[PDB]
Each structure stands twice: as C-alpha cells, then as structure tokens.
Design a protein around this ligand. Structure first.
Ligand SMILES: [Ca+2]
Ligand SMILES: [Ca+2]
Length: 77
C-alpha cells in the first residue's frame, strides 16, 4: 500500500506475536521456526536461527517486536 507507520507497525505487532509462541515480546530460534514448521517445512537450526538472526539486531538468538519491524518493513510494494 502507500501508508505504513502506525498502520504497518500495528499490523506487524499482531504478526510478531504469531511468530513468538510465548507472547513474551521476544522470539527465539524455534519460535520463528514454528511459523513454517506447522505449514510443512520443519527447518533445522540453520534455517531457524537464520530467520531469528536476520532480524536479531543485537544477535542474542532471538528478536523482539521492534526488531521484527526493522527486518520486516514489507519487502517490495
Ligand atoms: Ca518468547
Ligand atoms: Ca533480539
């Protein structure tokens, strides 16, 4: 769309939680990995930690909502 900010953030917040299976405002390797495991992929730490890392602004084996917004921010249009 052409309007994000609080609009994209709010939408992301709901999505972030989806990734975190504990709602602790934080996501670990498996946490973000369970987002595709139930679909039919069962990725290994390599792919699991990869996702959590690609967004881990600090690099602590997990990412927080705000971090999910830094890497998320849509992708193309
Ligand atoms: Ca958590
Ligand atoms: Ca983090």
């Amino acid at each position: 769309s052409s309007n994000l900010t609080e609009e994209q953030i709010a939408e992301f917040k709901e999505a972030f939680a989806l990734f975190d299976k504990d709602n602790n405002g934080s996501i670990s390797s498996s946490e973000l990995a369970t987002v595709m495991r139930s679909l039919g992929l069962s990725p290994s730490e390599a792919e699991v930690n990869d996702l959590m890392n690609e967004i881990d602004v600090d690099g602590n084996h997990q990412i927080e909502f705000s971090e999910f917004l830094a890497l998320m921010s849509r992708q193309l249009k």
